[PDB]
Amino acid sequence: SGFRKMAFPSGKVEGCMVQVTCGTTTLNGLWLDDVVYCPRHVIPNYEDLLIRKSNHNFLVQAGNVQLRVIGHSMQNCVLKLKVDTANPKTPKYKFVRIQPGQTFSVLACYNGSPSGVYQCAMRPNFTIKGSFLNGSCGSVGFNIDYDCVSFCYMHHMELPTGVHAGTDLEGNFYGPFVDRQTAQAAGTDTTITVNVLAWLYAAVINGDRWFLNRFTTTLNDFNLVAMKYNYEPLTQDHVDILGPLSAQTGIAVLDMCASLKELLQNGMNGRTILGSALLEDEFTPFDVVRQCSGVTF
Amino acid sequence: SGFRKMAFPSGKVEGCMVQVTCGTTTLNGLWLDDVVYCPRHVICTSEDMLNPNYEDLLIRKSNHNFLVQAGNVQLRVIGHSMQNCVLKLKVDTANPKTPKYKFVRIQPGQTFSVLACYNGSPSGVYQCAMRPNFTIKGSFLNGSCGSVGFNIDYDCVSFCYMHHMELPTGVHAGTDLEGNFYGPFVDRQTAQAAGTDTTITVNVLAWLYAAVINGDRWFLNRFTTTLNDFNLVAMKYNYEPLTQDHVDILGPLSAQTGIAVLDMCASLKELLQNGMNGRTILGSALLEDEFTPFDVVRQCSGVTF
Ligand SMILES: N#CC1(CS(=O)(=O)N2Cc3ccc(Cl)cc3[C@H](C(=O)Nc3cncc4ccccc34)C2)CCC1
Ligand SMILES: N#CC1(CS(=O)(=O)N2Cc3ccc(Cl)cc3[C@H](C(=O)Nc3cncc4ccccc34)C2)CCC1
Ligand SMILES: [Cl-]
Numbered sequence: 001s002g003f004r005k006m007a008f009p010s011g012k013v014e015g016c017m018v019q020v021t022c023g024t025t026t027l028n029g030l031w032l033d034d035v036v037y038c039p040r041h042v043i044p045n046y047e048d049l050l051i052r053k054s055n056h057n058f059l060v061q062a063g064n065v066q067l068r069v070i071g072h073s074m075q076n077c078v079l080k081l082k083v084d085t086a087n088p089k090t091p092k093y094k095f096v097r098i099q100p101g102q103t104f105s106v107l108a109c110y111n112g113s114p115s116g117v118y119q120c121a122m123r124p125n126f127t128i129k130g131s132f133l134n135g136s137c138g139s140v141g142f143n144i145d146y147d148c149v150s151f152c153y154m155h156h157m158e159l160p161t162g163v164h165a166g167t168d169l170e171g172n173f174y175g176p177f178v179d180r181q182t183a184q185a186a187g188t189d190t191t192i193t194v195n196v197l198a199w200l201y202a203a204v205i206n207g208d209r210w211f212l213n214r215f216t217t218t219l220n221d222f223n224l225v226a227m228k229y230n231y232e233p234l235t236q237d238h239v240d241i242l243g244p245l246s247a248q249t250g251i252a253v254l255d256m257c258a259s260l261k262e263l264l265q266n267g268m269n270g271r272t273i274l275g276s277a278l279l280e281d282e283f284t285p286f287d288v289v290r291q292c293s294g295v296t297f
Numbered sequence: 298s299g300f301r302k303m304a305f306p307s308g309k310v311e312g313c314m315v316q317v318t319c320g321t322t323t324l325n326g327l328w329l330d331d332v333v334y335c336p337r338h339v340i341c342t343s344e345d346m347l348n349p350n351y352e353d354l355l356i357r358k359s360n361h362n363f364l365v366q367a368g369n370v371q372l373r374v375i376g377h378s379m380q381n382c383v384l385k386l387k388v389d390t391a392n393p394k395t396p397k398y399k400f401v402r403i404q405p406g407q408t409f410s411v412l413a414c415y416n417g418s419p420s421g422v423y424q425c426a427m428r429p430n431f432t433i434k435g436s437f438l439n440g441s442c443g444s445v446g447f448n449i450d451y452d453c454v455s456f457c458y459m460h461h462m463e464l465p466t467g468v469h470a471g472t473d474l475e476g477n478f479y480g481p482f483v484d485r486q487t488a489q490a491a492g493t494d495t496t497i498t499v500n501v502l503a504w505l506y507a508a509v510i511n512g513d514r515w516f517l518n519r520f521t522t523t524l525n526d527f528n529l530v531a532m533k534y535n536y537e538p539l540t541q542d543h544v545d546i547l548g549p550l551s552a553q554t555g556i557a558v559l560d561m562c563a564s565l566k567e568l569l570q571n572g573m574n575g576r577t578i579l580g581s582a583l584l585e586d587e588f589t590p591f592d593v594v595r596q597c598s599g600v601t602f
Contacts, residue, residue: 001467002436011308131301162298296418
């Protein structure tokens, strides 16, 4: 029993964190094989600013050991520093781009040293509600599938509302952001409907059934209601994805949708669901199945 | 900016997790130097659990009855001893991944990271707190026994908890790494229940200061309170008493924000009376009590917004 916001074990990623200094800027880098990946803003016309730089201008520190930079190149908003030593701690890995609604673990670092790990979701507005201070740039987001680390996020900046923006490991931003000090704001956000539904199934599995009702709804009627509360539309793919949890609890997805509709129109009436007075949307259907089954890495 | 429930990076602990099998029972062990630490109930059957005599059960075991697995490598057990509710298995190989460590016993209200494991394999990490009733609200399934709680301030791992059991309400009970249980609990399947739980007042206050540091002041008021009047009110909402030690501990956050502890106590009294009225504090519609004053100083900025 119990349902917590759970992150993946961070050990395979801790062994990849390094410090990258160039001039006055110090941030974090990801050392995989003989390449260190970091935000290109560590150096604006980025190609023009990069030609001036030489390999020795980039100081890379792995623990108390200085790494030698032997080459450098740019791929979108990420800088790739070729180093003379392959990371002996390089795990099995992939670079994957995630979609809004998907969750991942963040290993927050300062000066190449990991300080904390937390779980979060890519918001529908492409921002992440993280916890980062100055020096956290280059901190990474990841998932673990078997023994393979899938790197999905690299931290670049904070927006005026306190939310964060970044790129995949190929340097492509999540959202309409640019890596420069300019006027940019997060769009109006929405609630991840398929995730709230998954968390309602997690509550039923843990013995919290007060919100269940005898009613059902059509997918169209549910979406008409959900659009009025700034909830993301629920697709047939979302319904199919919730199939296993619907089979385990005996509550059809549209049956649970009628529960969600009543929760949106009436509130919780002084009651909580899994210790929360708000509807939680940062657990995917796979997160719920994994945590209520005990998958290891 | 931002405020998340943050766990310590788990890598130094992952390199210590092993699987311990005894007969039909399999659970997790903590391999530090040449010793594997695990719950002593690994020697029990489900029948034994009602009234187990661990000394009688242990004397019948030999070193080769304990199977210890570190990854895909079998460790050889060369000795065994019991210390309170923990079993210590002497192994023939020192863990080359043993970090710098300490065994610390924590007090209620203290927070720590839990690395939840099954079959000696880590599955997840989460942050939690020792409740005032000495239980923890964890996320544990069968096979998680032996999973550990820890803090990593500096590069030293301080082990503070080892998981032993789930009580009937779904909450969890366990020991420090010297085998002493937190609370009036026993490693027996006897009728035992967690005492009525209370809210960790000093932690809610710390989290209110974290909200002020992050730029939120809607809940503040023009009032102050005496410590005694605050406690008379707090007890009525099942909040733990606030002591002078708690007030002293909040001193640095009070100095950083410019809000006296007894003025922050007056905002809390008012929040308990009025609720949040559709508002949130740091993305939460409830008053959060699983961040200590030390967690807030570690996670938040040194400059108030
Ligand atoms: N807006 C804004 C702020 C950041 S900044 O103006 O100092 N800033 C401009 C900038 C422009 C482009 C790029 Cl790609 C990065 C960056 C940097 C960046 O965001 N860094 C950070 C990243 N994360 C968490 C931070 C917390 C605190 C301060 C920096 C933080 C630096 C001022 C309030 C937050
Ligand atoms: N009450 C109860 C339950 C546990 S048990 O009856 O299976 N059980 C009795 C027992 C008694 C004393 C001691 Cl020291 C250990 C133990 C064990 C124990 O708690 N294991 C576990 C530990 N953690 C999380 C679990 C979740 C699920 C099942 C086991 C879990 C075994 C049944 C619902 C939880
Ligand atoms: Cl303590």
